[PDB]
Design a protein around this ligand. Structure first.
Ligand SMILES: OC[C@H]1O[C@@H](O[C@@H]2[C@@H](CO)O[C@](O)(CO)[C@H]2O)[C@H](O)[C@@H](O)[C@H]1O
Ligand SMILES: OC[C@H]1O[C@@H](O[C@@H]2[C@@H](CO)O[C@](O)(CO)[C@H]2O)[C@H](O)[C@@H](O)[C@H]1O
Lengths: 144, 285, 277
């Protein structure tokens, strides 16, 4: 029963900088790594209707959620209001991911730092959002 | 060390663009050598941050403000707000500053060199988030080609006599290159040289081998403190300075006898701060 | 200006904790006054950033490394990589430094004082991202209480004669407070003072050469500079006349004079500065 623009289910998560790099945890950080065809690159995306937001859990550790910590990193953790995400759909499969809650009284979003479009070994951070044009804040959700 | 200093702020990405202010609007603009591009740094020890106050002469209470929640920058009435404070982080080795918002240090000032204005940004390794902060006097005088007139007669100038005769005297402005000087600031020494524009390497010099005599000589020498000068503004004036020598700062560049005739010697003399030791450094018209 | 300087790095959030490294592990640890807390800053002028290299005598090629994408900071073999370069941002308010990764300048070093190690944070206003970087000599000598022994005779030391008597001579080591000196550094004067621990406000310092104690006086400040390939031996030169060096008139026997005398390379002008046992 679809309530919104992005159906419930399992997804791969990519940065627009690379069609071949895939979101997964490495230690306590999140990063984009070579295709593993493993469950830790698979993400369960679930709409929460009361909130109009999304929870995103890892298939390998189904009770851990994409959340954020007090040092500016995206994280994998137990359920809390930090696990709620407000996507903005800007193209086919392309989204900006805002924390539901205002942080430091601004919109904050997933942000991956790049070096001439290279993101290898970068952690996914939570940084301020101002508009829909920041290449570093654009991510693909692919169903599979 | 930076509290209460009046400075220019320009872009590492484009050193010809300066923070420019008028009627609440901040933009990036060519050098003006005037108050539209001057800012007072005001330190708060508790916050450990600075306000950046415009030296606008009409609106006297304007400070660099982050227009949260946008990424825009303006000047607004100072209310001591957290969005009116900034961390001045000096990138050592790069002689440049990253300027972060105290309200939110995740965000720093970013020079849009094509739009010619400022915004807030997350960090990166580009020169677009790096700024050059400089004493406004140094900023104004460094690489400035000027004439130097005594305030007893502003129709006269300090000149080298010609390319081969290096003596320095007072004459009626005749627009010749022998009567123009380009000022350059040396940061290793915190002092200036005056290069006469009729030569490549000629600099205004105290001939400490001949008492008070002043002449132009080559810069081909290793290091001579006599070649270098301190330039200090006289209060209440836009273009008036006292010029003292690096070797011995009690020695001030001086017009002989406060005499205003053609030929009158320009020499150094013990600083008394009388009118004959005050100098107008100006644009050539 | 900082390229190739050997420095200690300590925490503004806790000024008793210093960057410490052993065998690839970086931690926050109390003052050691030794190579384990000493780092060489190496400037790459093209990146406008710095390698921070441990002065470990056993493994000489280790540098501070962010184990991207993790939260962990360690020391690895220098391979000149992006995760081994740091932006040194001096906060002009505080005389502290923020140390940001060249690989990701949004991330800066964060002192976890509870766990006594380093992690990473985005920029904020906390002291946990602020660091004090100081020339290692200054770091070791500042607020250090020491005995001062000549290279000629270790078992003897420089002293104020008595609380009543401000004169200064050479005497055998007896652990008296008149034989001990608290070194304080003055940033403005870029130089040192020696407080004698018998007095509150008496320091080492018009009668030519002789050296005495008293309450501008540029002559009372000094410059300590080390001598190559030693741990604790130094020269001490006077601020009002840098030509001057601390001299042992003779030496070697008791009561021998300690005076001002023009600098020479000789062993009577080299002084061991140690912790009192
Ligand atoms: O070495 C030349 C100096 O001439 C002085 O002018 C004299 C002052 C006395 O100092 O009074 C006069 O007698 C005129 O009333 C001058 O002979 C200048 O004041 C010095 O600046 C200096 O140029
Ligand atoms: O002012 C005392 C000085 O005593 C010197 O020792 C003399 C050297 C010459 O410099 O040679 C002697 O004659 C002994 O062979 C000494 O009289 C010290 O070298 C100086 O450091 C100084 O203490």
């Amino acid at each position: 029963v679809e309530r919104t623009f992005l159906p419930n289910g399992n997804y791969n998560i990519k940065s627009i900088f690379s069609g071949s790099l895939y979101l997964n945890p490495v230690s306590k950080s999140l990063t984009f790594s070579n295709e593993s065809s493993a469950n830790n690159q698979k993400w369960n995306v679930e709409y929460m209707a009361e909130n109009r937001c999304f929870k995103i859990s890892n298939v390998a550790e189904p009770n851990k959620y994409l959340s954020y910590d007090n040092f500016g990193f995206i994280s994998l953790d137990s359920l809390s209001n930090r696990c709620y995400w407000f996507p903005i759909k800007i193209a086919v499969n392309t989204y900006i991911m805002l924390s539901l809650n205002k942080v430091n009284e601004l919109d904050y979003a997933w942000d991956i730092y790049d070096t001439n479009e290279n993101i290898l070994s970068q952690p996914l951070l939570l940084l301020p959002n101002f508009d829909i044009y920041n290449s570093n804040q654009m991510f693909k959700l692919e169903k599979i | 060390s930076l509290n209460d200093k009046i400075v220019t702020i320009s872009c590492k990405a484009d050193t010809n663009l300066f923070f420019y202010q008028v009627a609440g609007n901040v933009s990036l603009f060519q050098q003006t050598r005037n108050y539209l591009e001057r800012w007072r740094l005001i330190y708060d020890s508790n916050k450990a941050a600075y306000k950046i106050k415009s030296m606008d002469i009409h609106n006297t209470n304007l400070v660099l403000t982050w227009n949260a929640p946008t990424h825009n920058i303006s000047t607004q009435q100072d209310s001591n707000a957290d969005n009116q404070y900034w961390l001045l982080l000096k990138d050592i080795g790069n002689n440049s500053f990253i300027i972060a918002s105290y309200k939110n240090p995740n965000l720093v000032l970013y020079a849009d060199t094509v739009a010619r204005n400022l915004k807030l940004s997350t960090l990166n390794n580009s020169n677009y988030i790096k700024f050059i902060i400089e004493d406004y006097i140094i900023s104004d005088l460094n690489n400035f080609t000027c004439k130097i007139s005594p305030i007893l007669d502003l129709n006269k100038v300090v000149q080298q006599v010609d390319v081969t005769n290096l003596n320095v005297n007072l004459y009626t402005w005749d627009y010749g290159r022998n009567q123009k000087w380009t000022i350059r600031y040396n940061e290793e020494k915190a002092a200036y040289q005056f290069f006469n524009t009729i030569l490549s390497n000629g600099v205004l010099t105290w001939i400490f081998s001949n008492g008070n005599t002043v002449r132009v000589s080559s810069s081909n020498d290793q290091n001579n403190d006599a070649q270098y000068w301190l330039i200090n503004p006289v209060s209440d004036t836009d273009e008036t300075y006292t010029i003292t020598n690096l070797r011995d700062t009690t020695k001030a560049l001086d017009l002989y006898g406060g005499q205003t005739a053609n030929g009158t010697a320009i020499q150094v003399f013990n600083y008394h701060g009388d009118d004959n030791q005050k100098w107008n450094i100006r644009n050539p018209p």
